[PDB]
Amino acid sequence: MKRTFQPSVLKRNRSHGFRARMATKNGRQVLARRRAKGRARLTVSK
Protein backbone atom coordinates (compact mmCIF):
# COMPACT_ATOMS: atom_id res chain seq x y z
CA MET A 1 0.00 0.00 0.00
CA LYS A 2 1.40 3.36 -1.11
CA ARG A 3 3.09 5.08 1.81
CA THR A 4 4.05 8.67 2.61
CA PHE A 5 7.55 8.40 1.09
CA GLN A 6 8.02 8.31 -2.68
CA PRO A 7 11.69 9.08 -3.45
CA SER A 8 12.46 11.79 -6.01
CA VAL A 9 15.95 13.29 -6.15
CA LEU A 10 14.89 16.29 -8.23
CA LYS A 11 12.00 17.07 -5.88
CA ARG A 12 14.17 16.47 -2.81
CA ASN A 13 16.84 18.93 -3.96
CA ARG A 14 14.33 21.56 -5.06
CA SER A 15 12.56 21.39 -1.67
CA HIS A 16 15.41 21.12 0.86
CA GLY A 17 18.55 21.67 -1.21
CA PHE A 18 21.31 24.10 -0.32
CA ARG A 19 20.21 26.67 -2.90
CA ALA A 20 16.55 26.34 -1.90
CA ARG A 21 17.40 26.78 1.79
CA MET A 22 19.78 29.69 1.19
CA ALA A 23 17.31 31.51 -1.07
CA THR A 24 15.50 32.90 1.98
CA LYS A 25 16.80 34.17 5.31
CA ASN A 26 14.59 31.73 7.23
CA GLY A 27 16.31 28.83 5.49
CA ARG A 28 19.61 30.63 5.99
CA GLN A 29 18.74 30.68 9.70
CA VAL A 30 18.39 26.89 9.56
CA LEU A 31 21.95 26.71 8.21
CA ALA A 32 23.09 29.08 10.97
CA ARG A 33 21.48 26.84 13.59
CA ARG A 34 23.01 23.70 12.07
CA ARG A 35 26.41 25.40 11.83
CA ALA A 36 26.10 26.41 15.49
CA LYS A 37 25.07 22.86 16.42
CA GLY A 38 28.02 21.50 14.44
CA ARG A 39 26.13 19.26 12.02
CA ALA A 40 28.33 17.15 9.78
CA ARG A 41 25.82 17.50 6.92
CA LEU A 42 24.59 21.09 6.72
CA THR A 43 21.95 20.52 4.02
CA VAL A 44 20.42 17.52 2.25
CA SER A 45 22.42 18.06 -0.95
CA LYS A 46 25.03 15.42 -1.72
Partner RNA sequence: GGUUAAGCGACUAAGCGUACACGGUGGAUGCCCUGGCAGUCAGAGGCGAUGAAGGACGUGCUAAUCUGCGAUAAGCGUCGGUAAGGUGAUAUGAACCGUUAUAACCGGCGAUUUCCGAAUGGGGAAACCCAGUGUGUUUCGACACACUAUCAUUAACUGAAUCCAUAGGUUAAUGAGGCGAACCGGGGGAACUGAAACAUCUAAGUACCCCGAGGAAAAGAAAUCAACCGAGAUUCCCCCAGUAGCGGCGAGCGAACGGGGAGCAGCCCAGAGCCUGAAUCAGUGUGUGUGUUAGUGGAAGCGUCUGGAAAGGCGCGCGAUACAGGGUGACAGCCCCGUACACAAAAAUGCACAUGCUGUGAGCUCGAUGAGUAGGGCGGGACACGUGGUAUCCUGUCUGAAUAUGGGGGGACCAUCCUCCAAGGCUAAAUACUCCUGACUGACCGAUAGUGAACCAGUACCGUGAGGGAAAGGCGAAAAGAACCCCGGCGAGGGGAGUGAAAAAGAACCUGAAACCGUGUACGUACAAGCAGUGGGAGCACGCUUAGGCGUGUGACUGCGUACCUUUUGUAUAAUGGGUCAGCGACUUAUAUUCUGUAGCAAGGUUAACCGAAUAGGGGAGCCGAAGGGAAACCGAGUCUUAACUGGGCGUUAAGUUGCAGGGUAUAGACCCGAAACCCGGUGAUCUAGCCAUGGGCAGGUUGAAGGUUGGGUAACACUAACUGGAGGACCGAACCGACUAAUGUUGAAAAAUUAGCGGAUGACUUGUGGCUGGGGGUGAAAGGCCAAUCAAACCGGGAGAUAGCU
Partner RNA sequence: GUAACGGGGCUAAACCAUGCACCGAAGCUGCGGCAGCGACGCUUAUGCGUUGUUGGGUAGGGGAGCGUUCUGUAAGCCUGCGAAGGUGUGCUGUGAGGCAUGCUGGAGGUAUCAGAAGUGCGAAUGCUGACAUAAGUAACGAUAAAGCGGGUGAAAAGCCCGCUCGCCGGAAGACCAAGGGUUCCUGUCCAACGUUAAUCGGGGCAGGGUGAGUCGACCCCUAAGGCGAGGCCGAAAGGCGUAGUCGAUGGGAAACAGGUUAAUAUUCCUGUACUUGGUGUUACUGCGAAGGGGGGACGGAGAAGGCUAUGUUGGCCGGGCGACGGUUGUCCCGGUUUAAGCGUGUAGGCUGGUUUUCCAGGCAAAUCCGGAAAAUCAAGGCUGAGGCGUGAUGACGAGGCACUACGGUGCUGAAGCAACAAAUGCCCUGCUUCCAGGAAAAGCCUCUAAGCAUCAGGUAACAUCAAAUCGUACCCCAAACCGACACAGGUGGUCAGGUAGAGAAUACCAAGGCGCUUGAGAGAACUCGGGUGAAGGAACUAGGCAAAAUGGUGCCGUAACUUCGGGAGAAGGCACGCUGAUAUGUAGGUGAGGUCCCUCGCGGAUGGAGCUGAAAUCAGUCGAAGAUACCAGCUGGCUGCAACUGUUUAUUAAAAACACAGCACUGUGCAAACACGAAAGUGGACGUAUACGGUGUGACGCCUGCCCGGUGCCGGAAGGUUAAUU
Partner RNA sequence: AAUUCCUUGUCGGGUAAGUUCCGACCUGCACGAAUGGCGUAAUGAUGGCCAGGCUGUCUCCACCCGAGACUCAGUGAAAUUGAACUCGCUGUGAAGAUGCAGUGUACCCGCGGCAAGACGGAAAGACCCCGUGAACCUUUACUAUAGCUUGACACUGAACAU
Partner RNA sequence: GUUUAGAACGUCGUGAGACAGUUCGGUCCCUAUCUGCCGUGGGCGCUGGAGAACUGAGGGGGGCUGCUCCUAGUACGAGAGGACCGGAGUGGACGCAUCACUGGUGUUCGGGUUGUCAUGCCAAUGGCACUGCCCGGUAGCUAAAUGCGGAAGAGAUAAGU
User: Smallest distance, Å, CB 10 to RNA?
Assistant: 4
Q: How many residues form the binding site for RNA (CB under 7 A)?
A: 44
Q: What angle do CA 2, 18, 14 make, to 5 degrees?
A: 40
Q: What angle do CA 33, 27, 24 make, to 5 degrees?
A: 140
User: Smallest distance, Å, CB 41 to RNA?
Assistant: 6
Annotate each residue in 15-44 with x if it binds RNA (CB under 7 A) or - if it does not, as one string.
Answer: xxxxxx-xxxxxxxxx-xxxxxxxxxxxxx
Q: Which amino acid is at 26?
A: N
DSSP 40: S
List residues binding RNA (CB under 7 A). 1-20, 22-30, 32-46
